């Protein structure tokens, strides 16, 4: 439930003490937990509502030059003067123009020439700022159990319901535990400061589209701008970048204007994210959040229930789910009330010895009418295994064949751990238990290497990284010194960033 | 007259036989001739009226996406189909999207997804073609002599007047000699094929501004386009470059459009020229024209005149003219009719021995009233020399001091010959006499080296040329082979192209 069609679901486990498994929650990737004797909830970061934004330097891109003039002098009368030189609503430039008897002068030489032009900008872009303290994360929980597949992405109504409940994570309150009343209460203390490296991420707004540009790229734009603390008729701080002065003679040179720089700043945004605007608050969908789940109050709901003793007809044809899990949905054709589904796996149905782990831990029926749908999730072993549901006579069976092997599972988990490391880096080691040598010391050495890497290379593209990886590959095969594996470390540390999408 | 305030005037001479001195006429640079006993005319290329242009691929830059749709299928039903896939007014893209029970499918896997979007372009650019055969050059002549400085750039009326007369050079008629009736007739056979390397120069029109792009740059643009043989609702041949498909799930992905590419194609035009549009004909101001002047019918007008025998009061304070020439303007306070001004130079006025050359050859007065202004042009020697005008008593004198030396004149003529060579190349040797070893053999070896250079490097900027000049400079000091002066030849052949503006 809610972690079923995401193609990026990670499974976490391993709480035999403490019950404080810690996770990072990206936007595209939901996370399913697994416990000893507690229900498996599915946590998923949905939005990130950046709220109450200020303004910084609002650039311009649509410049309209009008109301121009010119003035000159003979080659000894000094430079020219103009009334439209003495307001900063007009752009000006002085330029030496060759003059003589044909231009009514007295000598022959570099006569000066000033021209002016009123700068009228029509469509400007606005770069808002993002404080780190008014982020507003939105994590939606979803337990596994008594709910059919019609309530997987169904978000309409979760205050009345209990199986899914959402929580907000503000930096003024990372102490938010959701009340799954009957399941207990999932304690949840996130860490919204260390999000997507905020306070360097301006919120660029143009043409009613929105972005998350880096602060570096936003300050390094050569365009006309004014400070954001402004109102109508702004004062453009640097107009020389959008006007071009071709120098035609005879005491007036031509002031052409560069056109709409829309597409240029569009194709200059080769790495920024996209966001939407919900009015005053800019809701985006990206980033991550190193939370930490305290399962001190997750109890199984129907552990004091009997076993269902009726039909259990199948429905909705059970199917594999891209990691090997199997989402069986059954309907219970009886009236046993708040009862419990006797599901398991079996390599053979002569003995019925359960082998695969059941992801939907303690799967119950919460209804009491005739038909009551419910959705399981099972994880078969590699090979052939039957899906057994029902206690005795009128049990059901759907034979399964989970493809692959344990070596393939270990390789896929390795490559997705490398992908999660390539996306997050520092916060990749925050995915498990208390750590003594793999979640604290590893975070230390990876933090040191990530700082001394992202300050070393730090500014390379997708393609220049391939070029520098080929360069350190050639350096990593022709050297007779000890820095063969150091250049190969910078080979792997770059090309794994390239192997991901 | 008309070659007085151009700061690029070249002087040509040397007709002691043939009388067919040949010149190249750039737009910014006027050309003054000098003869044995013929009047010095001033020739100047004014416009270049490219007329009757066709159309080639007219690109688009303002794309407006509207009326979009989407369609999908379950992970085994093949790809999607749409009615808006079967017209080329809509852009489409198929993309695999992960689907499951939450999207109402039957399996879990790569379900396909097609989206469409109507391509509506608003502001398109049009690249016209330029045939080499409908160029229409416009050379304006101007003789030296009986005309004041009010008629230097005065172009209004030259059919009634004789001292200036214009000619057109079409490729259907490079046989155009102007009738300076009384001065004779300047024979003039130009060569309008070898202009600014035409038939590679498209005429890019956008936003009612105009350019002369290379054909290579115009065909190498990745933008939507259609062939120019068209009318309303065109068929855009390649729309994939201005739409971007971000893939959001749940059977509809978002079709964002890149904005106005105006500024991007503006800053991509880092080397094109600018032109104007005169309606149907595109008048530009650039390039050159290797003409050839036959002075077989240039006679002095007032060579059978007496000498003026009256006041010759100065007017308009005589001044130097950036090459050392001195443009004295006098008014004749008498009534001697069509008479002749007795002007000369003098290093001392005890002997009055003329030393400097008089540029305004045989300077006459054509009026007969009380006051009659006339403008001379004299070239003093290096040092101090007096300007003597008038025969006897009531002669006038303005002492002159021409600054510089003959070595400085030779160096300046060398650097402007190198600048003319750096601009033209092949046609730089077409600036003088018949040639046996300096205008034919030199054109041969320079033609060979210019072809084997402009096909060798041929595509480098202003800055990459500096980089490659530094590279061949370092190669030109550390080699023990014979290719030291060859790398230094490619040093000079590049850095002289960089020393010019």
């Amino acid at each position, epitope marked *: 439930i809610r972690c079923i069609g995401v193609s990026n679901r990670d499974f976490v486990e391993g709480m035999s003490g403490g019950t404080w498994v810690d996770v990072v929650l990206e936007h595209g990737g939901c996370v399913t937990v697994m416990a000893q004797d507690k229900p498996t909830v599915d946590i998923e970061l949905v939005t990130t509502t950046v709220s109450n934004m200020a303004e910084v330097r609002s650039y311009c891109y649509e410049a309209s030059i*009008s109301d121009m*003039a010119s003035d000159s002098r003979c080659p000894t009368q000094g430079e020219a003067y103009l009334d*439209k030189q003495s*307001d900063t609503q007009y752009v000006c430039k002085r330029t030496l123009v060759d003059r003589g008897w044909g231009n009514g002068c007295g000598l022959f030489g570099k006569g000066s020439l000033v021209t002016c032009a*009123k700068f009228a*900008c029509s469509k400007k872009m606005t770069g808002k700022s993002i404080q780190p303290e008014n982020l507003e994360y939105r994590i939606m929980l979803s337990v596994h159990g008594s709910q059919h597949s019609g309530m997987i992405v169904n978000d309409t109504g979760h205050e009345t319901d209990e199986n899914r409940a959402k929580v907000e994570i503000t930096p003024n309150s990372p102490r938010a535990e959701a009340t799954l009343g009957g399941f207990g209460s999932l304690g949840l203390d996130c860490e919204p400061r260390t999000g997507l490296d905020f306070s360097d991420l301006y919120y660029l707004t143009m043409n009613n589209k929105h972005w998350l540009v880096h602060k570096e790229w936003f300050h390094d734009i050569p365009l006309p701008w004014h400070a954001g603390a402004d109102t*109508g008729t702004p004062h453009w701080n640097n107009k020389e970048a959008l006007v071009e002065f071709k120098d035609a003679h005879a005491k007036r040179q031509t002031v052409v204007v560069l056109g709409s720089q829309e597409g240029a700043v569009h194709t200059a945004l080769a790495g920024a994210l996209e966001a939407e605007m919900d009015g005053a608050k800019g809701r985006l969908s990206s980033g991550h959040l190193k939370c930490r789940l305290k399962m001190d109050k997750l109890r199984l709901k129907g552990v004091s229930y009997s076993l269902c003793t009726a039909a259990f007809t199948f429905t909705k044809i059970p199917a594999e789910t891209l990691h090997g899990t199997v989402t069986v949905e059954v309907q219970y054709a009886g009236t046993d009330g708040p009862c419990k589904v006797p599901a398991q796996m079996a390599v053979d149905m002569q003995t019925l010895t359960p082998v695969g782990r059941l992801i939907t831990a303690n799967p119950v029926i919460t209804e009491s009418t005739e038909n009551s749908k419910m959705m399981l999730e099972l994880d078969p072993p590699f090979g052939d295994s039957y899906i057994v549901i029902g206690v005795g006579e009128k049990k059901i069976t759907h034979h399964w064949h989970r493809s692959g092997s344990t070596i393939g599972k270990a390789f896929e988990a390795t490559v997705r751990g490398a992908k999660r490391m390539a996306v997050l880096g520092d916060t990749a080691w925050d995915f498990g238990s208390v750590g003594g040598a793999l979640n604290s010391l590893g975070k230390g050495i990876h933090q040191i290497f990530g700082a001394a890497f992202k300050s070393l290379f730090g500014g390379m593209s997708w393609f220049s990284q391939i070029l520098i990886g080929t360069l350190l590959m050639w350096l990593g095969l022709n050297t007779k010194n000890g820095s063969i594996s150091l250049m190969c470390l910078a080979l792997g540390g770059v090309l794994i960033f390239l192997s991901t999408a | 007259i008309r070659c007085i305030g151009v700061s690029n005037r070249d002087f040509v001479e040397g007709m002691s036989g043939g009388t067919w001195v040949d010149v190249v006429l750039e737009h910014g640079g006027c050309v003054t001739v000098m003869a044995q006993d013929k009047p010095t005319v001033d020739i100047e290329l004014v416009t270049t009226t490219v007329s009757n242009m066709a159309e080639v691929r007219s690109y688009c830059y303002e794309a407006s996406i509207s009326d979009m749709a989407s369609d999908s299928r379950c992970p085994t039903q093949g790809e999607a189909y749409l009615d808006k896939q079967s017209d080329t007014q809509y852009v489409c893209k198929r993309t695999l999207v992960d689907r499951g029970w939450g999207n109402g499918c039957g399996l879990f896997g790569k379900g396909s997804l097609v989206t469409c979007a109507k391509f509506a372009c608003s502001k398109k650019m049009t690249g016209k073609s330029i045939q080499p055969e409908n160029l229409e050059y416009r050379i304006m002549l101007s003789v030296h002599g009986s005309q004041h400085s009010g008629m230097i750039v005065n172009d209004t009326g030259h059919e009634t007047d004789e001292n200036r007369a214009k000619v057109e050079i079409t490729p259907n008629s490079p046989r155009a000699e102007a009738t300076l009736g009384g001065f004779g007739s300047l024979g003039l056979d130009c060569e309008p094929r070898t202009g600014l390397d035409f038939s590679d120069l498209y005429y890019l029109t956008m*936003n009612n501004k105009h350019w002369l792009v290379h054909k290579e740059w115009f065909h190498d643009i990745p933008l939507p386009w259609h062939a120019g043989a068209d009318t309303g609702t065109p068929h855009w041949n390649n729309k994939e470059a201005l739409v971007e498909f971000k893939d959001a799930h749940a059977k509809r992905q978002t079709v964002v459009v890149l904005g106005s590419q105006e500024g991007a194609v503006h800053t991509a035009l880092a080397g094109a020229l600018e032109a104007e549009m005169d*309606g149907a004909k595109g008048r530009l101001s650039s390039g050159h024209l290797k003409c050839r002047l036959k002075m077989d019918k240039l006679r002095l007008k007032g060579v059978s005149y007496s000498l003026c025998t009256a006041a010759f009061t100065f007017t308009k304070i005589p001044a130097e003219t950036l090459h050392g020439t001195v443009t004295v303007e006098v008014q004749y306070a008498g009534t001697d009719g069509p008479c002749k001004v007795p002007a000369q130079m003098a290093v001392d006025m005890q002997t009055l021995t003329p030393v400097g050359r008089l540029i305004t050859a045989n300077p006459v007065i054509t009026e007969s009233t009380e006051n009659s202004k006339m403008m001379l042009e004299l070239d003093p020697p290096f040092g101090d020399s007096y300007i003597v005008i008038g025969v006897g008593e009531k002669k006038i004198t303005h002492h002159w001091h021409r600054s510089g030396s003959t070595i400085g004149k030779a160096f300046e003529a060398t650097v402007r010959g190198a600048k003319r060579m750096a601009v033209l190349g092949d046609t730089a040797w077409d600036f003088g006499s018949v040639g046996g070893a300096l205008n034919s053999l030199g054109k041969g070896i320079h033609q060979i080296f210019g072809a084997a250079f402009k096909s060798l490097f041929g595509g480098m900027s202003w800055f990459s040329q500096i980089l490659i000049g530094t590279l061949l400079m370092w190669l030109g000091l550390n080699t023990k082979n014979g290719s030291i002066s060859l790398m230094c030849l490619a040093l000079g052949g590049v850095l002289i192209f960089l020393s010019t503006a």
Partner: antibody
Amino acid sequence: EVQLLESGGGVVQPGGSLRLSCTASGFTFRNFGIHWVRQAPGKRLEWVAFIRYDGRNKYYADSVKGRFISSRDNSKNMVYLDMKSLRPEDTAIYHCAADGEETSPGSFDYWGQGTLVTVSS
Amino acid sequence: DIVMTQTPSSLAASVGDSVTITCRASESVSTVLNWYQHKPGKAPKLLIYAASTLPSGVPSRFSGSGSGTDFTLSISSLQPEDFAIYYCQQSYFSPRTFGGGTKVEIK
């Protein structure tokens, strides 16, 4: 919309003075610009004056330079045109035309009705 | 200082015609030029700014185009509220100078 009102015009003896009051309403007056244009009868439309939003930058035409003093009131929402020492060539309808700043670039935007200013013998 | 000459100022058309008045420039004004709809005893409103585009409020029958040397105002269907004084006006070269005024008369 744009209630651009005009006042102050009447009959004027030559060499006299005149203060043209233009009161604006219907927008934010501080962040726009304001012009002064005239309609000489028998001839075309002309332009005589221009003020920036700051209240100190004042531009005029060649005929009225050194003759017109044009100011504005941000607080009481007024535009003033202290014309002094007029001539009988200045008989027109001095419209109070609002500039198109940052919205309709390079254009006289919405006009005022203009008062009748006649100077004769 | 520049002048804005145009089409002969007298035209008499019926209601619902397609009139195209051209404005001829003196020099290269380059698509910064305006038009006005003026009635006697009435303040003029802006009709076409920047030689191509329109503000809000006015109907889209008014279509202006052209630059360089000649400009044009085109109305698709002459409503009876359009019989007014039309003149073009540049804003490239300063001082800003208007056209001549073209009367649209009833037929």
